[PDB]
Design an enzyme around this catalytic site. Structure first.
Site, mmCIF file in Angstrom:
data_model
loop_
_atom_site.group_PDB
_atom_site.id
_atom_site.type_symbol
_atom_site.label_atom_id
_atom_site.label_comp_id
_atom_site.label_asym_id
_atom_site.label_seq_id
_atom_site.Cartn_x
_atom_site.Cartn_y
_atom_site.Cartn_z
ATOM 1 N N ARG A 85 0.753 -1.228 0.108
ATOM 2 C CA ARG A 85 -0.112 -0.009 -0.086
ATOM 3 C C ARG A 85 0.917 1.089 -0.165
ATOM 4 N NH1 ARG A 85 -2.988 4.361 0.375
ATOM 5 N NH2 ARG A 85 -5.399 3.894 0.702
ATOM 6 N N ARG A 94 -5.723 1.188 -4.532
ATOM 7 C CA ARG A 94 -4.746 0.878 -3.843
ATOM 8 C C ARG A 94 -5.036 -0.563 -3.711
ATOM 9 N NH1 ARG A 94 -8.042 3.339 -0.307
ATOM 10 N NH2 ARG A 94 -8.281 4.953 -2.050
ATOM 11 N N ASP A 97 -6.633 -1.926 2.237
ATOM 12 C CA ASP A 97 -6.783 -1.070 3.227
ATOM 13 C C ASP A 97 -7.371 -1.764 4.355
ATOM 14 O OD1 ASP A 97 -6.556 1.591 2.298
ATOM 15 O OD2 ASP A 97 -8.476 1.601 1.091
ATOM 16 N N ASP A 99 -9.393 -0.965 8.187
ATOM 17 C CA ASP A 99 -9.880 -0.218 8.967
ATOM 18 C C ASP A 99 -10.164 -0.749 10.313
ATOM 19 O OD1 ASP A 99 -10.706 0.664 6.107
ATOM 20 O OD2 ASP A 99 -10.858 2.454 7.218
HETATM 21 C C1 LIG Z 1 -11.867 5.512 -1.696
HETATM 22 C C2 LIG Z 1 -12.528 4.690 -0.777
HETATM 23 C C3 LIG Z 1 -13.373 5.663 0.253
HETATM 24 N N1 LIG Z 1 -13.603 3.977 -1.515
HETATM 25 C C4 LIG Z 1 -14.143 2.867 -1.456
HETATM 26 N N2 LIG Z 1 -15.135 2.340 -2.383
HETATM 27 C C5 LIG Z 1 -15.397 1.042 -1.937
HETATM 28 N N3 LIG Z 1 -16.218 0.606 -2.589
HETATM 29 N N4 LIG Z 1 -14.780 0.212 -0.880
HETATM 30 C C6 LIG Z 1 -13.735 0.682 -0.191
HETATM 31 O O1 LIG Z 1 -13.213 0.117 0.601
HETATM 32 C C7 LIG Z 1 -13.321 1.879 -0.442
HETATM 33 N N5 LIG Z 1 -12.426 2.790 0.373
HETATM 34 C C8 LIG Z 1 -12.021 3.579 0.246
HETATM 35 C C9 LIG Z 1 -11.220 4.272 1.279
HETATM 36 O O2 LIG Z 1 -11.019 5.443 1.318
HETATM 37 N N6 LIG Z 1 -10.666 3.235 2.154
HETATM 38 C C10 LIG Z 1 -9.601 3.483 3.125
HETATM 39 C C11 LIG Z 1 -10.339 3.296 4.521
HETATM 40 N N7 LIG Z 1 -9.446 3.709 5.743
HETATM 41 C C12 LIG Z 1 -8.272 2.978 5.543
HETATM 42 C C13 LIG Z 1 -7.468 3.179 6.955
HETATM 43 C C14 LIG Z 1 -7.242 4.657 7.413
HETATM 44 S S1 LIG Z 1 -5.828 5.285 6.657
HETATM 45 C C15 LIG Z 1 -5.274 6.956 7.479
HETATM 46 C C16 LIG Z 1 -5.135 7.103 8.924
HETATM 47 O O3 LIG Z 1 -6.330 6.586 9.501
HETATM 48 C C17 LIG Z 1 -6.011 6.714 10.869
HETATM 49 N N8 LIG Z 1 -7.089 6.116 11.385
HETATM 50 C C18 LIG Z 1 -7.890 6.490 12.137
HETATM 51 N N9 LIG Z 1 -8.881 5.952 12.669
HETATM 52 C C19 LIG Z 1 -8.758 4.668 12.058
HETATM 53 C C20 LIG Z 1 -9.149 3.521 12.242
HETATM 54 N N10 LIG Z 1 -10.427 3.138 13.017
HETATM 55 N N11 LIG Z 1 -8.777 2.307 11.590
HETATM 56 C C21 LIG Z 1 -7.724 2.634 10.863
HETATM 57 N N12 LIG Z 1 -6.992 3.725 10.743
HETATM 58 C C22 LIG Z 1 -7.449 4.950 11.477
HETATM 59 C C23 LIG Z 1 -4.521 6.063 10.994
HETATM 60 O O4 LIG Z 1 -3.938 6.855 12.137
HETATM 61 C C24 LIG Z 1 -4.002 6.415 9.589
HETATM 62 O O5 LIG Z 1 -3.036 7.198 9.506
HETATM 63 C C25 LIG Z 1 -8.443 5.475 7.014
HETATM 64 C C26 LIG Z 1 -9.520 5.073 5.753
HETATM 65 C C27 LIG Z 1 -10.587 5.839 5.941
HETATM 66 O O6 LIG Z 1 -11.642 5.126 6.292
HETATM 67 O O7 LIG Z 1 -10.502 6.957 5.360
#
Ligand SMILES: CC1(C)Nc2nc(N)[nH]c(=O)c2N=C1C(=O)NCCN1CC[C@@H](SC[C@H]2O[C@@H](n3cnc4c(N)ncnc43)[C@H](O)[C@@H]2O)C[C@@H]1C(=O)O
Length: 162
Positions: A85, A94, A97, A99
């Site tokens: 990643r 990417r 991911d 979460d």
């Molecule tokens: C483009 C988009 C929207 N379109 C999609 N479309 C479909 N169909 N399907 C998808 O899957 C899909 N995915 C997409 C997507 O953007 N996905 C990324 C999801 N994640 C991944 C982990 C974090 S990365 C950055 C920081 O976040 C902080 N951080 C804070 N809280 C947490 C937590 N609870 N867990 C992990 N990291 C956390 C850390 O400290 C890290 O530095 C945030 C990001 C999110 O949710 O924004």
């Protein structure tokens, strides 16, 4: 003991999407402090937020762990890293991911860690597979609310869990 339960969502929209997902779960599971307890089916989902890219494969896993929330977070980031990643990618495609959606029933508001995940109830690609493996949510959301978000956001079973 591994007394803490956490739910983690996985997405991938580059390359062999199912492989990345599969290797993510394998890497997590290989850590002696994580036990993977349940895995959702794999859903193919329309890209959200930036729609000019490939569809996603999305699933959700439930784990038992003795890791703290910050410890769990650093493991998932190492897994992300191991699967190529690119840190800089925000909206585009990417490899993987991870979460952290839920951690026990804790409400976590650190600079780098918000739990429950602040977007999880706004994302059908999270909620649908989460409900498959979490019954507490399963009641907190109608069954026709689940198949209604499937339709509107374009979420479909891609591979049945067994
Ligand atoms: C483009 C988009 C929207 N379109 C999609 N479309 C479909 N169909 N399907 C998808 O899957 C899909 N995915 C997409 C997507 O953007 N996905 C990324 C999801 N994640 C991944 C982990 C974090 S990365 C950055 C920081 O976040 C902080 N951080 C804070 N809280 C947490 C937590 N609870 N867990 C992990 N990291 C956390 C850390 O400290 C890290 O530095 C945030 C990001 C999110 O949710 O924004």
């Amino acid at each position: 003991g591994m007394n803490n339960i956490a739910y983690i969502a996985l997405g991938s929209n580059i390359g062999e999407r199912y492989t990345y997902l599969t290797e993510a779960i394998q890497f997590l599971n290989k850590n002696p402090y994580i036990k993977v307890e349940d895995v959702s089916s794999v859903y193919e989902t329309e890209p959200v937020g930036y729609t000019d890219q490939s569809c996603f494969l999305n699933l959700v896993i439930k784990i038992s762990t003795n890791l703290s929330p910050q410890e769990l977070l650093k493991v998932t980031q190492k897994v992300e890293n191991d699967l190529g990643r690119k840190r800089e990618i925000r909206w585009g495609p990417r490899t993987i991911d991870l979460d952290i959606l839920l951690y026990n029933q804790e409400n976590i508001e650190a600079e780098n860690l918000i739990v429950p995940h602040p977007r999880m109830f706004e994302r059908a690609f999270v909620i649908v597979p989460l409900l498959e493996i979490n019954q507490d949510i399963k009641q907190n959301i109608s069954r026709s609310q689940v198949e209604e978000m499937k339709r509107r956001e374009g979420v479909t079973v891609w591979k049945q869990k067994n």
